[PDB]
Design a protein around this ligand. Structure first.
Ligand code: NPI
Ligand code: NPI
Lengths: 321, 318, 321
C-alpha cells in the first residue's frame, strides 16, 4: 500500500534508553512507493505504523539504495551514518492515533513544516507519549540527570542554561518555515502552523495543532486546536479559549486584551478589553444602531460582518451591522 | 543551640570582592547538632547568623570531619574543594531578617527546594542585599564589567547572551523541584514555591515568596506574597495584586484576563475578563438579589461565583 | 559642516555580502570637526550620509590618526583592526530618513544609548532596511542558511538555540544603560529608551522608538512611538495602542491598572482603573461625584489629575476629579 508518511530521524535518549526527542531534517508526506520498496527490506518493515531504530551501518545501506530514486534523502542518510547520536526511521502506513514518541514527533514536524494543516492529522493520546524533559543549551536532558549536570557546570565556573521544562519543545529548535517572523521563539511550540506572511510578536503565543493561514499579525494567545484565517489581526494580550472548537475567519480584528469563546466569521471585529463567551447575552443591532433583539453569542457564531463592543454609558454588550 | 538552617555554597564575585550570587547544591533545614558540632570549630562559628567564607583547604577538612556523620554533605564538600570559584558557609541560628547576600540566597533556596512555604520565613529588607546584576550564558556578570565583555565577544565574531538584568535570578538556574512543568523558565524567580503536579505555562509568572500547593495550572501572574491552594486553575493573563495579603483557596477557577484584589475562598469562580477589587460594589445573589456588599466583606468565603451582567454591566456574586 | 553622528562598527554578513546587523561599541552624537577631519580622507568621505566599509588596514590607520584627538575612539579602532568580522564606518551629515542597514542600526543605538529621545530622530522607511534574520546563540544567521546549521548541530548531539526570528534584535545584545532593571531581556527591542530608575518586569514590553523618562515600573506593553513620563507605573498586562491619528504618550506620576488599556494620551498624575480599556471615541461621564456632562475621551486627552474608573453597579465609564 501507499504510506501516509515516512522520515529518518536523529534523536536523544536517557540512560534507560527511553527516547526524549527526535529531529527530522526532511520529513515526507505520502512518500512514493519507490522510496518505500527500497527501504523496507533493510529496516525490516512489513506493515502498519512502526518506529524502527536502525544502526549506523544500515544508514549507509539505506543511503546507497536510494541513489537514483531520491537524491536529497540519500544525501541526508550519508550524514546520518556519521552521527554521534542514535537513529530512528518512522514509517506511518495510515493517519492514526500515535503509539510511539518517534511517531509523535513526526506528526508535529508535518504540522510545522506546513505539510499538513491543523485538524488534518490524528493526535489522540499524544500527551503520555511526550516525556517531560529539561530543554537546555546542550540539548534535551532527563530531569533525573539534571542536578548532577547543573553541579558540574557550576564547579567549572560556568552555567547550564535551562530554558524550558516541558513535554513540548519550542518549534524553532526543529524548523523555521519561510516568510515568517517570530519575535520570541519560546512562545511557539513544535506542532504550530505558522503561515506565510505572519508576524508572531513577543506577547503572541501559538500552541500545538494551532496557528495561522497567513498573512497575519499575532500579538495574542492562539490556543491548541485554534486556526486563524488569512489577513486577521490578533491584538496584544487577546485570548482564545481551550464543546466547540474555536476558529477565526478571514480579515478579522481582535482588540488588545479582548477574548473569544466562540468561532468568529469572516471580517468580524471584537473591541479592545471585551471578553465574549458562548453564553454571553448580546444586543443585536441594525444598519442604524437600533436594537433588533437580544440573542446569545453562540447563535451568532460563524457569521460575517459582526462588530462586538461594550456600551460605555450602560455596560451592555452590543453587536452591530 | 539547634540551628535554623545551614548550607555550603559556591558563588561568584566581582573585581571588588562583593558577592553577586551563591549556589547551594544541598541546603539543610534544621540541621542536626552533630553536623554543627563537627563544622563550627573549623569555620570559626560561635553564634548567631553568619556568612563565613572558607578556603579550598577548609573544604577538605570539613569534608573529612563529616564522614560517619553525614555522607551526602561530605561528598559535596570534596567536590567543592576542587572548585574554580570562591566558597561560603552560611549558618543561621534563628529565622531572622537577613544581613548578608549569602543568607538572602539561602532563604530563597529553602523556598524553592520546598523545605519551607511562603510566609514561613523572614525576608524583611532583602532587596538592598540582592545586587542588580547581568545574568549571561557565561554566568553572573557585574554591570560595570559588562560592556567590555560584550566587546570582546563581538570582536571574536561571537555574541554574549544576556537574558536578564535583575536583583533576582530565575529559579531553574539553581533548582527544578520534582513533578513540575515550567514552559518558559524566565518567568519563575528563585524563591518561588512550585508544588507537585503544577504546570506553569508560557503566560504564567511566579515571583519570590509565592507559588502553589500543587497540583495546578498557572497561565497567569502570581505576585510576591501570594499562595495558591491545591487544585486551583489560573487562566491566561489573569492577575493577582501586589493592606491585605492575597491568597487563593482549593479548587478555584480564575478566568482568562480576569483579576483578583481580594483573597478567594475554597471553590471560588471568577469569570473571564472580570477584575474585582476590595472596594468593588458587588451584587450578592441566592438568582435573586439579596443585597449589595463590598468585595472585601466577601473575602475568604467558599463557593462564590464572580461575574458581570452582559446586559447592564453589573458586578454580581451568585 | 558639523556632522549629526558617526560610529565605527563591527557587523555580520551572509554569503551574498548583504549586512544582517552591526554592533557599535561607542556611538557619537554630534562628533567634533577634529574627529571628522582626521577620519574623512582615509575613509573617502566627502559629504552626505554614508555607510563606508573599511578594511583591517584602514582600522590601524584610523586608530593612529585619532591619537591626541580622541583616545577612547583610537583604542577601539586598534581592537577593531584585529577582528574576525567585517567593519563599517557610518557618518551621518544630517538627521534624515535612513538609506542603509548600517545607518538604521546606528540610529537605534543612539536611542538605546540614551543619546537621543523618542521622536527626536528620523526613522522613516526603516523596515525594508532591516532584514529578517535568525537570532541564535552563535550570532545572527541568514534564514536560507539556517536549516543546514541546525542539522550539523544535531549530528554532533548538540542544539543550535534560536531565540528570535525578526527584523529587530533585542537591546541587551548591544547595550544595557545604567541604573535599569530588565526581568526578561527578550521583551525590549534595540531602539528602546529605558530611563534611569526604570524596572521592566517579565510581562513588560518596550518596542523601538519608545520607552521611559525614568524612574518607573513597567509590567505592561509600551508600543512603538510611545513615551512614558517620570514616576509613572504601568500595571501587569496593561496596553498602549500602536500608530502602525494620534500619538499616545503618558505623563508624569500616572498609574495604569493591571489589564487596563489607553487609546489616548494621558496627562500628568492620571489614573486608569484595572480592567478598563479607554479609547478616543469612548463616551465618558465627567464628574466633579456629581455628573457634570458626558464627553468623548479624546476631549480629555493631555489633561491632568483625572481618574478614569468604571462604575461597577451600572457599567458607566466615569472620570472623576
Ligand atoms: N486549555 C488551554 C490551556 C492548556 C494548554 C496546556 C498544554 O497543552 O500543555 C488550551 O487549550 O490552550
Ligand atoms: N502594534 C504594535 C507592534 C506592531 C508590530 C511591530 C513590528 O511590526 O515591528 C505597536 O505599534 O507598538
Amino acid at each position: 500500500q501507499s504510506l501516509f508518511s515516512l522520515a529518518f530521524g536523529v534523536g536523544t535518549q536517557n540512560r534507560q534508553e527511553a527516547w526524549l526527542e527526535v529531529f527530522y531534517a526532511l520529513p515526507l508526506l505520502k512518500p512514493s512507493s519507490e522510496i518505500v520498496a527500497a527501504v523496507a527490506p533493510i529496516l525490516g518493515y512489513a506493515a502498519g505504523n512502526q518506529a524502527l531504530t536502525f544502526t549506523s551501518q544500515q544508514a549507509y545501506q539505506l543511503a546507497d539504495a536510494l541513489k537514483g530514486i531520491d537524491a536529497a534523502q540519500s544525501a541526508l542518510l550519508s550524514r546520518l551514518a556519521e552521527s554521534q547520536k542514535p537513529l530512528v526511521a518512522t514509517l506511518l502506513a495510515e493517519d492514526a492515533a500515535p503509539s510511539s514518541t518517534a511517531e509523535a514527533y513526526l506528526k508535529l514536524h508535518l504540522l510545522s513544516h506546513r505539510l499538513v494543516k491543523p485538524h488534518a492529522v490524528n493526535l489522540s493520546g499524544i500527551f503520555p507519549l511526550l516525556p517531560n524533559v529539561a530543554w537546555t543549551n546542550i540539548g534535551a536532558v532527563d530531569l533525573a540527570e539534571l542536578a548532577e549536570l547543573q553541579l558540574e557546570a557550576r564547579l567549572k565556573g560556568k552555567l547550564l542554561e535551562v530554558f524550558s521544562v516541558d513535554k513540548f519543545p519550542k518549534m524553532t529548535d526543529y524548523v523555521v518555515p519561510a516568510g515568517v517572523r517570530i519575535a520570541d521563539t519560546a512562545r511557539v511550540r513544535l506542532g504550530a502552523y505558522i503561515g506565510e506572511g505572519t508576524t508572531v510578536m513577543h506577547e503572541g503565543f501559538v500552541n500545538f495543532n494551532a496557528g495561522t493561514e497567513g498573512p497575519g499579525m499575532i500579538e495574542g494567545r492562539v490556543s491548541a486546536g485554534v486556526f486563524v484565517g488569512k489577513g486577521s489581526d490578533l491584538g496584544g494580550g487577546c485570548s482564545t479559549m481551550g464543546n466547540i472548537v474555536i476558529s477565526v475567519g478571514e480579515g478579522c480584528l481582535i482588540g488588545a486584551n479582548a477574548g473569544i469563546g466562540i468561532p468568529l466569521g469572516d471580517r468580524n471585529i471584537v473591541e479592545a478589553g471585551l471578553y465574549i463567551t458562548a453564553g454571553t447575552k448580546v444586543a443585536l443591532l441594525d444598519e442604524q444602531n437600533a436594537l433588533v433583539k437580544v440573542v446569545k453569542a453562540r447563535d451568532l457564531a460563524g457569521q460575517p460582518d459582526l462588530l462586538f463592543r461594550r456600551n460605555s454609558q450602560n455596560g451592555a454588550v452590543e453587536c452591530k451591522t
